[PDB]
Amino acid sequence: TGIPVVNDSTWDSLVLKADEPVFVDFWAPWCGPSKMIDPIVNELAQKYAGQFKFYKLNTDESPATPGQYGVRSIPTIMIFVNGEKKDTIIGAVSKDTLATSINKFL
Numbered sequence: 001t002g003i004p005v006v007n008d009s010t011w012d013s014l015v016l017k018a019d020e021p022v023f024v025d026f027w028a029p030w031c032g033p034s035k036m037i038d039p040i041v042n043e044l045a046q047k048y049a050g051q052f053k054f055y056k057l058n059t060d061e062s063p064a065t066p067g068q069y070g071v072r073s074i075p076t077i078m079i080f081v082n083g084e085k086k087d088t089i090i091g092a093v094s095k096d097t098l099a100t101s102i103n104k105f106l
């Protein structure tokens, strides 16, 4: 069980057109550090429920969006507000690092 998925088909409607700030987790199953963040992304999604949307994009399954947005390594977190990219947090970082960035858009 984890956060909902976004893919290339739904990127515009779920991320760019969202009512709420959005946290996006770029990950892939070949990258173990990008999977090891799932418990703290899930903790964040529960804590921030109703203030942020949370989605994960599998760069193996949805290659167009990471290509377009210049993703070079995973995990990569991006935050969007009203259609605008507001932050990028690259690499397997602490929950506190992520909460700092999330709270900036609260």
Ligand code: NA
Residues within 6 Å of the ligand: 046, 047, 048, 049, 050, 051
């Ligand atoms: Na909340």
